[PDB]
Design a protein around this ligand. Structure first.
Ligand SMILES: Cc1cccc(-n2nc(C(=O)O)cc2-c2ccccc2)c1
Ligand SMILES: Cc1cccc(-n2nc(C(=O)O)cc2-c2ccccc2)c1
Length: 123
């Protein structure tokens, strides 16, 4: 409906990256998905997601959610609610947000566009 950016949890990306609170169940839009280089292990998918204000490319799907990308409705433009996630930190200090449980609220085809004008989160 109208006010599309209101469909997303504006501020959730900053909340995740600055507060590290995991009790939230934010609604985010998938902007892009791509495999990361693995080899000799199940594929892993990285997501560029948006909360309407910011985008962040630090998301990775838990492997248990791979079928959503491979078989069902998880692709660019879909709107999802994250029901469970954890933040992990690499040795170099970069954070990786692992999505453990997510629900597709609106399919890519039902949304069809990048909502709002989100800008990259700097961190
Ligand atoms: C920090 C971050 C967040 C999300 C994805 C990535 N990432 N992207 C790629 C890739 O090949 O594109 C590889 C990684 C990676 C993840 C964990 C450890 C080492 C590398 C990195
Ligand atoms: C210690 C640490 C730091 C960052 C990410 C993780 N991590 N957690 C999961 C998971 O699915 O739970 C998967 C990874 C991962 C491991 C190697 C490369 C890319 C991602 C673990």
């Amino acid at each position: 409906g109208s006010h599309m950016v209101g469909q997303l949890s504006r501020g959730a990306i900053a909340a995740i990256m600055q507060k590290g609170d995991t009790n939230i169940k934010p609604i985010l839009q998938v902007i892009n998905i791509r495999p990361i280089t693995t080899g000799n292990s199940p594929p892993r998918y990285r997501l560029l997601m948006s909360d309407g204000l910011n985008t962040l490319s630090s998301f990775m799907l838990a492997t248990q959610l791979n079928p959503l990308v491979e078989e069902e409705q998880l692709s660019s433009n879909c709107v999802c609610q994250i029901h469970r996630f954890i933040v992990n930190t690499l040795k170099d200090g970069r954070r990786v947000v692992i999505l453990m449980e997510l629900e597709v609220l609106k399919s890519a085809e039902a949304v069809g566009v990048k909502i709002g004008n989100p800008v990259p989160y700097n961190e």
